[PDB]
Amino acid sequence: AMCYIIAKRFKKSGCVALKAKRGKELADFATDLQKKLGYDIQIVAITRPTAYGEYEPYKFVNSFEEFSIEASRL
Secondary structure (H helix, E strand, O other), X not given: OXXXXXXXXXOOOOEEEEEEEOOHHHHHHHHHHHHHHXXXXXXXXXXXXXXXXXXXXXXXXXOHHHHHHHHHOO
């Protein structure tokens, strides 16, 4: 199924979001990025932004590479 993968700093408002297919590729990508960014950053999959208004404002990106760049700037 489809989801959004989300990166968010626990102590700051807003997030980075990428629409993505659930699967092993996404799980590996998210696991690797979680290691690089550390414990202060949350990486989570959600169904859709309106179900998670607490992560606003959303910055949407269109590739894994752009997601990694923007997540690292949080």
